[PDB]
Design a protein around this ligand. Sequence first.
Ligand SMILES: c1ccc(-c2cnc3cnc(-c4cn[nH]c4)cn23)cc1
Length: 251
Amino acid sequence: PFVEDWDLVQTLGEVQLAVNRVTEEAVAVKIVDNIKKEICINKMLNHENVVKFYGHRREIQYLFLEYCSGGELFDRIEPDIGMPEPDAQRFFHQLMAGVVYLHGIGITHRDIKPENLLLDERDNLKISDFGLATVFRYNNRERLLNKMCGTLPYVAPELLKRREFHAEPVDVWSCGIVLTAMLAGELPWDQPSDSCQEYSDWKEKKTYLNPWKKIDSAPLALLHKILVENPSARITIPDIKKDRWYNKPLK
Ligand SMILES: c1ccc(-c2cnc3cnc(-c4cn[nH]c4)cn23)cc1
C-alpha cells in the first residue's frame, strides 16, 4: 500500500516506513483511524534530539515523521548487562538536551523509555511519539498534571500517590530509570509503589542488590539524586548537568 508518492515498505511499530518513489527519501508514517493534540504539539517542535515532524494529511490520518535508521535505544541495551558506560553517557546527554528543550517550550513527553528513544544513522538519539504529550506551561503559567499515564517501571512515585503533581520531576524520574537500564540492562521495579519489594529496598539504600551493584559509584551517585521519592527534593536537570559523572570523561 502507498500514500501519495510514498510507498509503505515495511511495518516499524501503526507506523510504516515510507519511501518516496521520486526523491527516494525514507520517512516514518503514522496511520490513525487525542490525535489532534499530537499533530499540534509536533508542529511546535524543532530540536536535533526530537523526531522531526514533516506534516500530516487526512483521508485515516497520516503523520509524517523523521525515520531513524538505528531504531530503538531498547535494542542497544543488552539484557542483564546494559551498554558500555561511555555509550550510555552520550545517550543520556542527548536525552537531557531533548528533554530540556521540551521543558523550555512547556512540553512534557510523559512516556520516556528506551522504546521511545530512537536512533538515527549517526546514532543520534531522538525523543519519539508525542501521543501522550501535553502542555504543563502556557503563558508563563505552570499547570499541574492530574491524569495518570506512561509505563509503570519508568513512572514516578507521586503520580501513583497524588491528586496532582509537577510534570518536570516525573520526566527526570523516567530518565533515571532509563539511565539504570543502560548501565544495568535491567529494570529495578515493576512499579515505584511501597507495596513492591524492590522499591522499598532502594529506599533503604540496599545498593548491594541488583541492579545497583552492577553500576559504578559515580553514576550510582547521580541515580541516588534522581530516584528521590520527594518530587521536590529530587534533582533538577540544571543540577544533573553539574553532576560529576555527567561531566566525567569516558572511553
Ligand atoms: C523499530 C525500529 C525503528 C523504528 C523507527 C524508526 N524511525 C521511526 C520513527 N518513528 C517511530 C515511531 C514509533 N511510534 N511513533 C513514531 C518509529 N521509528 C521504530 C521501531
